Amino acid sequence: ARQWQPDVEWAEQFGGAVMYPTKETAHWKPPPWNDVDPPK
Amino acid sequence: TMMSGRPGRVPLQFLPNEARSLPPPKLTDPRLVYMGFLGYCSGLIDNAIRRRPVVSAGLHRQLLYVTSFVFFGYYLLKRQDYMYALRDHDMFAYVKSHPEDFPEKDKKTYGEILEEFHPVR
Amino acid sequence: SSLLDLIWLETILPKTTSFIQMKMSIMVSNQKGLIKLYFLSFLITIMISMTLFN
Amino acid sequence: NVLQIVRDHWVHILVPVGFVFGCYLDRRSDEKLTAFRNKSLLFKRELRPNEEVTWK
Amino acid sequence: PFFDVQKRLGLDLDRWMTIQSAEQPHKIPGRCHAFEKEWIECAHGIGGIRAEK
Amino acid sequence: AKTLLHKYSDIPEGTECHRKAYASTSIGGATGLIVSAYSIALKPPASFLEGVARTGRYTFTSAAIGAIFGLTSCISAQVREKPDDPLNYFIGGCAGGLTLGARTRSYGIGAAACAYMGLTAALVKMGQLEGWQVFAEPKV
Amino acid sequence: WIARTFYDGPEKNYEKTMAILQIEAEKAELRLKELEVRRLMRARGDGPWYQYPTIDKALIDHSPKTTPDN
Amino acid sequence: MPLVYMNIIMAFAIALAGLLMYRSHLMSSLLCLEGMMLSLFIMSTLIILNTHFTLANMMPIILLVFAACEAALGLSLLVMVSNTYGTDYVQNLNLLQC
Amino acid sequence: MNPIIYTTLIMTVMSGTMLVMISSHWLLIWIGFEMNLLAMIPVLMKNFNPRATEAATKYFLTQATASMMLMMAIIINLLYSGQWTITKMFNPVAMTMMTMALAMKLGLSPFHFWVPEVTQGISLQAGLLLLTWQKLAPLSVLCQISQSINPNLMLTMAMLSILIGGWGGLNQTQLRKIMAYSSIAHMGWMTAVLPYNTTMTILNLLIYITMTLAMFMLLIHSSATTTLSLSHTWNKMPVITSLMMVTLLSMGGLPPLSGFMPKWMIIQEMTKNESIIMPTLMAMTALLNLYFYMRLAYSSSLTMFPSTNNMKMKWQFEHTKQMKLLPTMIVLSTLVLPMTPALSSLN
Amino acid sequence: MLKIIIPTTMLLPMTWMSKHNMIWINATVHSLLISLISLSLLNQLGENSLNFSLTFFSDSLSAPLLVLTTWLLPLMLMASQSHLSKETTTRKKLYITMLILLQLFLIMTFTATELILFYILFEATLVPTLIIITRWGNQTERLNAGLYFLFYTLAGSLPLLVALVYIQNTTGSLNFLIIHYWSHPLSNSWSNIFMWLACIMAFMVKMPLYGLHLWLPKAHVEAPIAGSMVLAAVLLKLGGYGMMRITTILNPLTNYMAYPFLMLSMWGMIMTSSICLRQTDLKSLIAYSSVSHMALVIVAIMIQTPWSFMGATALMIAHGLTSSMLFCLANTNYERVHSRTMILARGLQTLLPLMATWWLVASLTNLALPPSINLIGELFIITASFSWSNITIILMGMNMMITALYSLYMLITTQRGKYTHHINNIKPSFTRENALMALHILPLLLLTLNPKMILGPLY
């Protein structure tokens, strides 16, 4: 009765570091929201 | 074609003097009308982006967009027509000066030409 | 309905293209970000271009 | 009420206007293809005493 | 691409350095002055293709 | 450079099976060496010996592909006695593709490779016959 | 009445088609001629097109050069 | 083309290969770039002096100056990289990837 | 940095590009390249953070190596003919070295590796400048020596650029990497026609710059740097997302959009030189760019993604600083196909 | 021809400056007026054409297609009225804008004196349809469907462009009249074979040819009602029109190249028809019926005889009308049941008798009952195929049989039997739906009076 729209499950497909994750890139983390890293 | 090296070309002129011997495009040229339409669309999109009444937010701004587009369009049309005139001029001059490379083909009628016939069966 | 239309006609044109382009995209974009490898490849390309195109 | 319903019914006028404008543009496009008027081998005709063109 | 400002305004920003045979200081000649002069006066105003051939 | 290609083209299509096979083997070896060099540069796998093992694997694979291609194409050409025929090249390409699948040891790749390689070899033969240019000179 | 009010005689369409055919045949001939002329000028270089630059001869210094043999 | 020019060319090629190898230590990359500059200077100077093309004697100086400035620029960048990691190691620059 | 210093550095970048364009001496072209590189580095690092510094050092290394190769080519060309004027390259591999140096400056494959990561490191204004203005000088130099170029090398690099851009863009969720791979593909298209007609190269560059400027200005306006951040934009400024989807379709080469004009013309030009296989491969490969543009359009405007509660606050504020020419850029990147024959102006 | 192009453009400002509650009325009225004006195009000559100008020309192959294109917009508006009621005024105006743009592009496509302009508008029709499918689509697969409908098409049409420009480099013109008058035979060669394939497969993908038809069930199932109508009625006929236009240059090569596709069609019309027998979805069944009919049209075009061309034209027009009406009926059921499954809602004749009569007439036309124009086209194609070869009749005959079966199957599963007990929200049919079916069906039974108006230029 309602037009389907994306949900969180569908949205998380575009949240990774890359599309099509593989074993080598499985440990890749998306960059910080602001382009700043901890100085460590 | 590469008319960049064409002799007697001033390095940075939009319109040479010899282009003034060609008829200027009319003010009701369809291309000028399309350029004005492009300006009007730019005005509408400007109104929409700033979150203003699209049709009737700034009429002075929309008029200025249309005027600028028509201005640049008229001058661009003049330059484009000039360039095509140059291309045709060089074409005809080279054909005239090289009669051996463009021989007159013999005129023949279909009554004495034998073309293969392929029936559709 | 099943064997040709939903399985093999789908396997031949669309799915093969999708799989091949996905594999090629993964291969091209899987770069470690190390300029060491990039400049070694640059050296290889320079030698190949000198040795092949003349 | 005139000048009040017009503000709400003015949109209707646009489509007919486009049609008459298109007819005018068709006639203008026709007048630029008159290079063979009354010169074809099939329809070559002598003008009437008060005729300037065969087709307009 | 190439915008020929020097030719349009007659500025000569860098043409003085392009060739050996163009007004060296104290009239010091290049080692191949005559050959380059002959090549230039051969190929002037003729175009690249005809000059190569 | 182009020397290998000239040695391959100098041989007639319907003669000298061994010469064509050897020239194709050399060309395949060169292609495998280049792809191995790029793979090693962009991906240092683990060490010197594993790298040279991977290089040898790729080189032998490509050399085998080229060898089977040339051999099968030339035998088909001689047997059929119809040179300048695209189908003979296609047969060689499919055979070459089949060999690649065998090295891989997966049936799916062999079928895919055979069709794709055969089509490509037939296209190359057609382009040779009709003079199709990949890198055309600037005529106009 | 329909023919009188809405349509026109056959001669109008006939002659308009003749004019259109003339225009487009001329355009096709001009296109072939342009391709041939471009090929010839680019191969030879004796026309106004494809004129690549050469060194200006007004740059050469014609004066004694401290050495008789230039 | 005598053997001196060819030796300078080979020196330039060796410097370029060393630059593109990147064992480690971006400072070595800068050193290879500066070796490339020096080979360019030597080759250009020999060419200009041999041909007696007087007005081009300015060219090496300008060359040197400009590329020397480039070196300064590179050094500054190196310093900041070190100040982020404590070392100028090449592999430390892997936050950005293709 | 200080606004006056930023203006001065930008003017120095533009002055370096103009010096490359207007000069007829190889040394002055090299000087212009050096000046552009020298003034470009602070612009990338205007916003200070480790990522920007790494991007700047990558860019410096690549551009310095390219400048050294270019000077090496100039020296060889002088050695084999005492000429400093930018004309016929007068030699073998000196021309090859010049071509490789200019390809590395442009980002043509296989020298493309620096573009995605340098674009990712820097901000969106820096990315806009890097992907638009930094292509004018090497392309002008290439247009000047187009007759010297060995067609095989340039066509190989152009085909590789198109293939690599198409394949690399498919894997990306970050918008700056998408723009970088799109730039690589469009560079391949631009250089694939240099051996045949430089007017087509300039027209492609102009259209690409217009579309890229519109895309980057839309990205900055709706300050999103990833796919999911852009997926929230419909809930605040849906007209921006609609314009962005239209511009994405335009960049994909779909008629009757503006992005169809370059490819079409380029293909046409090569068919005049009886090259048939290459244009077909180029179009079939540009299908990949169209695919990932369509994926971005799906995630952007054709579907409504989940939003957040805190977006409600954003509903109450407008943009203080507005970008002029953005409407003009969108219009010029979308609705200029009927004015196609204007390219005879030798744009 | 600008007398039709300009008003369709004026439909846009009229829509955007309308009331929030008067957009549908205004759009419907002015679309119907434009259709009435375009009725003028039907008058044709036994000679060449109606050459309006250097840019647009009309023929008796273009005229029925143009009339159907103009007529289809008001019906699309009427059917789109219902499911867009809860949409904001801006988005409803955007939907109407997409429909108007699509009509304008189709109108300019069917005149298209030059082949590159035809190609540009032919591929311009891709964008509004894609947005309609992927934006106002109910299911989650619409996005996937859109991708299919895009890339297939482009995969077929990117080579065509190359071929087209190549032709202009050799002949000098792509103007249809000069291409007709200056035609020359194509020699059998690898280059000519590939140029033939590049010219043909672009239009082969959109018919669609069996084996290249996969995008069609997806695009038809996942699109809204207006999208389905425009896809089945007109957008499938672009390939047939393009083949009729472009085959004048592919002879004598076409006879040699006909076999690979003819088989794929002659066997294909069997397979797809058989697929219609086992289908749990109405929209997929109607899509596969469209595939079968267009396969027969492909055969007719490839045979290349006057009877073939007349039959193909008549079948294209008739199939457009019939498939549009069938999709409308299925949508009226779907808007009540929300299921899109044939077996779920049954016995609808007892509940909705007039809609059952509409279903019967639509299925009878789909079944090719004489003397409907559907059977005129089918019969002309069958006679032409028999003249081509006497064995084709077997295949043709089987298809006819199979067609009848599934048609009546579709009528019996949904209309006859016992109603589903637990469905109690089947309200009586509105005047809107009944008028929609009437306006689909009456032109068919009126065109069966004057067949020569849809039989094409070879009549």
Ligand SMILES: CCCCCCCCCCCCCCCCC[C@@H](O)O[C@H](CO[C@H](O)CCCCCCCCCCCCCCC)COP(=O)(O)OCC[N+](C)(C)C
């Ligand atoms: C008993 C009668 C039987 C026949 C009935 C016929 C009725 C005809 C109605 C349908 C006609 C369709 C239009 C056909 C042509 C229209 C387009 C074009 O061809 O005509 C234009 C002209 O169109 C007409 O001017 C206007 C036609 C408009 C018809 C509208 C009828 C329906 C209106 C309904 C309004 C209802 C009232 C409002 C209620 C709210 C251009 O003609 P023009 O270039 O000049 O011709 C010159 C001919 N010359 C050169 C030989 C002199």
Ligand SMILES: CCCCCCCCCCCCCCCCC[C@@H](O)O[C@H](CO[C@H](O)CCCCCCCCCCCCCCC)COP(=O)(O)OCC[N+](C)(C)C
């Ligand atoms: C989206 C398409 C691009 C849009 C770009 C922005 C449009 C606005 C531009 C505003 C005006 C710019 C022109 C500047 C006026 C004087 C410039 C003059 O000095 O230059 C002349 C040249 O004039 C310009 O080049 C023409 C610019 C016009 C660009 C428009 C054509 C774009 C293609 C058609 C798309 C339709 C767009 C329609 C709306 C803009 C002389 O050039 P010349 O030194 O002798 O030769 C150099 C070129 N060579 C080296 C290759 C030989």
Ligand SMILES: CCCCCCCCCCCCCCCCC[C@@H](O)O[C@H](CO[C@H](O)CCCCCCCCCCCCCCC)COP(=O)(O)OCC[N+](C)(C)C
């Ligand atoms: C249920 C209760 C019913 C009660 C009513 C009973 C009345 C009995 C009549 C019912 C049908 C019997 C048919 C009897 C024939 C009469 C009509 C026929 O004679 O006219 C036809 C003529 O009709 C038309 O040709 C057919 C109508 C065309 C339909 C076009 C539709 C227009 C708008 C629709 C939109 C377009 C969508 C489709 C795109 C193509 C054939 O005439 P024709 O002998 O030949 O010559 C005409 C006159 N001449 C001699 C001057 C030349």
Ligand SMILES: CCCCCCCC/C=C\CCCCCCCC(=O)O[C@H](COC(=O)CCCCCCC/C=C/CCCCCCCC)COP(=O)(O)OCCN
């Ligand atoms: C959804 C999938 C549909 C995809 C359809 C795509 C296939 C279209 C057919 C081939 C496309 C390219 C054809 C070439 C375009 C026309 C150019 C032309 O006519 O000129 C030919 C061009 O010839 C070629 O270039 C052919 C090269 C083909 C390379 C690409 C091959 C792709 C695979 C083809 C095999 C498959 C065939 C059936 C495909 C069906 C679709 C699935 C002659 O060459 P000239 O240079 O002019 O020679 C004159 C002097 N002797």
